[PDB]
Amino acid sequence: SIEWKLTANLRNGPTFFQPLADSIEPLQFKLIGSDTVATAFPVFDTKYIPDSLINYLFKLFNLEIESGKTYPQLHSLTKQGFLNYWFHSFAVVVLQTDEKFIQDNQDWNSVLLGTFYIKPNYAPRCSHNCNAGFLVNGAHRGQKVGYRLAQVYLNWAPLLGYKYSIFNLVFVTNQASWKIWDKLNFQRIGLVPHAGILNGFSEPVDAIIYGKDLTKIEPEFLSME
Amino acid sequence: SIEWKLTANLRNGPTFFQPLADSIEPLQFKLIGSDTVATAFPVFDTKYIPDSLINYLFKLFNLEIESGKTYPQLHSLTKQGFLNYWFHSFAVVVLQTDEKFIQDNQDWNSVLLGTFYIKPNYAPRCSHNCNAGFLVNGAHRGQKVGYRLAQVYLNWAPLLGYKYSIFNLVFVTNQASWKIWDKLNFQRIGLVPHAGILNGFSEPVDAIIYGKDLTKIEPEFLSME
Ligand SMILES: [Mg+2]
Ligand SMILES: [Mg+2]
């Protein structure tokens, strides 16, 4: 079956625009500067992925929240809160594997490289703008996983019908700003001063608002080889 | 009793900052270029205001939504959806009266000038940023009600503990942009291209993102006399 990669099953996506593909096929590529193979997988519904992984990601996100430097949340989410948050619409998981399917009961602390969600950033009239949030396994720090996650995003978001990308809060202290978003030609379309009270910072941290046109993307950025 | 104007009863406001006043006292002033008196009232909870008014505002908002030019919603809200939306945290009603209390069963189509909500625009670490949405009774068009609503906002938002104001979507075709926000020195801290599909516009409409520092406001703008 291929129900698990059918755009027909897209929940809570764009109101005014249809998907540009009937399916999202898993995307294989190598980690930057490596011969190690990774595969990105679509997640239209949580049932199409193993519970053990979901529960892993659950913990991964709360650790990221508990660090207090990246996301605006103060507190850790409940399991149901996390499901409603990360899997409200669409998500992606990226695994260190060469297989074109997700296998059960894997050692996620090794195999899980990263994940992100994609949802409409606004209500229906503006729902062609998508938002995304990203997480990288800390065990795979320093391997440029976040950059690859962004390329996958650039490849897949438009396929869901999105025409433009919005990140509402990217903290200047977040190295993804200059390591990734700037590198991929995401525009800093705004700045919020003193936006966030963050763990380990005496003063409030400014936040960047990033935008990008998903209809006019640089092939250089789309290519994973 | 004065429970109805106690900041102690503020629901779902800022996590890190307390109110600067123990109460919000109703604010009287005149409509611009007029001797007609208006009074602004705090709403910390819907129980402190008459149902007939709430039901009026309910309809007023859905008309505004149905126009399809100002808000991102496509569809009219249910009564419970509207309550959860407009009264999630704080709200204000502005009435054409000289009284310092809200009276029941009034002719709102005449007496209701306008309303707005104030809530945190983000989760806790960034919850000192407030969002607001405004509505003016169409029967009082052309009387500069929206400008006064903004001045009330500027007076009261900081009192709730907010330090900065964010409007995430103000459509360029919305005359409030230049009639009000620009006039009151709200900065256009960003722009989203083609943000919204709007009723009566062939092409997508850009949206402005407005910010303002609520700790350093111009007294000129705060004064209602
Ligand atoms: Mg196909
Ligand atoms: Mg007092």
Swiss-Prot record, chains A, B:
Phenotypic consequence of N131A: Increases the KM for AZC 20-fold
InterPro entries with a match to the protein in the record: Acyl_CoA_acyltransferase, GNAT_dom, Mito_N-acetyltransferase
Effect of V145A: Abolishes acetyltransferase activity
Pfam families: Acetyltransf_1
Effect of G146A: Abolishes acetyltransferase activity
GO cellular component: cytosol; mitochondrion; nucleus
Subunit architecture: Homodimer.
Protein name, UniProt field: N-acetyltransferase MPR1
Organism for this UniProt entry: Saccharomyces cerevisiae
Organism classification: Eukaryota, Fungi, Dikarya, Ascomycota, Saccharomycotina
